[PDB]
Design a binder for this molecule. Sequence first.
Ligand code: HEM
Ligand code: HEM
Lengths: 394, 394
Amino acid sequence: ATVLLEVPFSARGDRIPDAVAELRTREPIRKVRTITGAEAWLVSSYALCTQVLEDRRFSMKETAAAGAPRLNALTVPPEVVNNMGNIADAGLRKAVMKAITPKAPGLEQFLRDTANSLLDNLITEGAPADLRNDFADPLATALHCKVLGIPQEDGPKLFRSLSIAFMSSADPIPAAKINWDRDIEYMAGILENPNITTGLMGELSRLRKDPAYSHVSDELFATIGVTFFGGGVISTGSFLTTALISLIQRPQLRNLLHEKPELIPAGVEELLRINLSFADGLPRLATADIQVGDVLVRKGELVLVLLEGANFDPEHFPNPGSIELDRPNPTSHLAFGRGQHFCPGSALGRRHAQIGIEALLKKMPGVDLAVPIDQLVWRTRFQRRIPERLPVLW
Amino acid sequence: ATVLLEVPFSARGDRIPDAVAELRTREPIRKVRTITGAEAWLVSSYALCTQVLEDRRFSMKETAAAGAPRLNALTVPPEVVNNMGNIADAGLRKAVMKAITPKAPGLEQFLRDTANSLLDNLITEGAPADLRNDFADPLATALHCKVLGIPQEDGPKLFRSLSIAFMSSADPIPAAKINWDRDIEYMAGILENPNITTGLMGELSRLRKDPAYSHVSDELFATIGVTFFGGGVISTGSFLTTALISLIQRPQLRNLLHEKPELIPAGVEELLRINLSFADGLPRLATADIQVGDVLVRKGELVLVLLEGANFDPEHFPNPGSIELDRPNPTSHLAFGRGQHFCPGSALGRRHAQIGIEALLKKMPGVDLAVPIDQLVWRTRFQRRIPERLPVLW
Ligand code: HEM
Ligand code: HEM
């Protein structure tokens, strides 16, 4: 007798388990047990992943319901799971989305300047350098302070919440509440701070005092700052980190992008497609009985949309493990999700990675791992897959 | 068909696998495969562990031999594996051992002052605090700068080598050589630096210019600094970290030691006994055919002495998983090894932990984990078991 198949399969973010393709072929929707002991349906084909993400009867909001089968414990208040819904209902969606595009004057130059400064500092100190802690994450943190309009010096303290805030835990996490409450207080102060006039928090600060938003809660305004800083930083920092591993492990690709930087956007799109940064399937709760492939999912059941299931599906992306810069369907991956909850920061996440990579390849054209790849230490029980340190030489 | 049992069994340092007791009972010396693919004999009973460690025909030195079956790749030059032998042959053993006792005037006060400052800073910043990165390791690093006679400001840079230097890798590690060569150059400079007159490096500096040591190599003098700083810091920092977890998970014990600090030495001895800080068995190479239990180990074969095998052996330590402050054989554990290569820093390691714990319990009598224990992230492919961060509240 064996136990019900457990998820997640592996915290390693440098390779997809052979098991994923076997599951996709044999049983692209199948029952699994999550870290809480709850049962769930793991969906691993491109077709079924899209189906689930595009049917709102598979609800994000309802995953926060008391007594629901859980992927993991909430690390935010239950109402915050519906954060984008709350933003939309408040009439704030357009303004929030506009503030977090890479289009603001000076933003891309700021990114390039920041990347180059970080890289110059690594070069001065000499190899080995840690490209996560001393490049990708600092670049992500600087970017999000700029986007939010908050002081760069405040970034580190907000950043330090994230190793707990984005845990994927069987049980509630006391420290997550301590940090959440503290970071909310910080964002509340920012909204009352007359120095903060630019970026997302500058715009929210103004809308908060506009009559069209007088009955929008101060809690929501602060929540938007905490959730967008944390989500953006953890997502961009983690993605860039694991993309750099993928790049470094492909010297031919590294050289091509170095020689022809105009190909970096197409390269970043493939790096997004093959990215293993999301450690768990995206959770949804069925609000009706719904047929998904050979399974009738029942109302109240948990469904997990495995992004790498979709993104390595050879039926949609032939030779799925290979980076090919000339695919006919390059942005059709699910790295940013799909449907109602499609990532609002997709353009910014793309630009962060594109600029970081462009800068790294110019400054460190000889970049390579400084340790055998197996020596990377993969963070466990976390909502992202990331190496604790990424040691390189050049 | 299953593969030959692989070591190590688990990188988790908060619990011993049930498998260890099963092995000890069934086959206290048995064949295993190491991360390099080499075969080895894993020894897991107190009796057989002692036998191997007390028979120099199971050689430390010879583990560095070209073509030997390997636990892992060397991270130091092969001659450095015989570092203590080299120290003894140079006539330096007594002086080195004397410099690294906790007995030097002011040393214990320095430790207490340092621990208390670190803890005051955590208290000021507010919970959660990371007791590894912001307590145990800094305390270890400060201690070793003081013991060596080198500036406190140089500690951080030396410390940063250690996440690579003490890797347990299948393959050689380029960064380990970069850092080793750099740290050797630093220690060489220290020996030539007239400001350095105290501690181990002050004493070595003087002996180096004494006629009785004129033909001792500059390489050996520098090597002693690098190996004692790194080994001491990684050993004490890692031990204290995992001891604090053991303590925190036993509130009754925490309270007893808080109420009766005179029991802290006995508590630290039990924490040493149950400690899972060594990630791999201690390696030795057979230089003869030697009977160990039911196995005739052949000349040239690798033997791995599993410390927790010995230390959780109920035949030697009844109710082995329980901390009991009144055992009749409390220091008879193998936490510091046994025989020819018994730890020269044992007294200093004991004092570091005793003082760190004393200070922590006085300042933070309410100390507890701030995350569920399963959320700790255990460093992999490393010579020690340690959580990447240790989040606490108080
Ligand atoms: C490469 C970088 C990024 C990746 C791969 C990524 C990935 C994703 C994914 C997969 C989702 C879907 C969640 C779901 O459907 O369950 C999502 C949604 C979301 N993302 Fe991103 N993200 C990135 C960057 C960002 C940035 C820069 C921000 C904001 C500054 C951001 C904020 C959000 C928010 C607030 C949601 C929730 C959308 C909703 O619930 O409707 N992300 N992201
Ligand atoms: C709680 C703290 C410590 C623990 C648990 C510990 C553990 C050990 C163990 C198990 C060995 C035996 C290695 C073997 O036989 O294969 C050893 C040896 C050694 N230890 Fe420690 N150690 C600690 C602290 C220190 C300190 C503070 C120093 C120096 C400042 C140090 C330096 C060394 C050295 C140089 C050896 C090699 C001995 C030889 O090869 O003959 N250790 N230690």
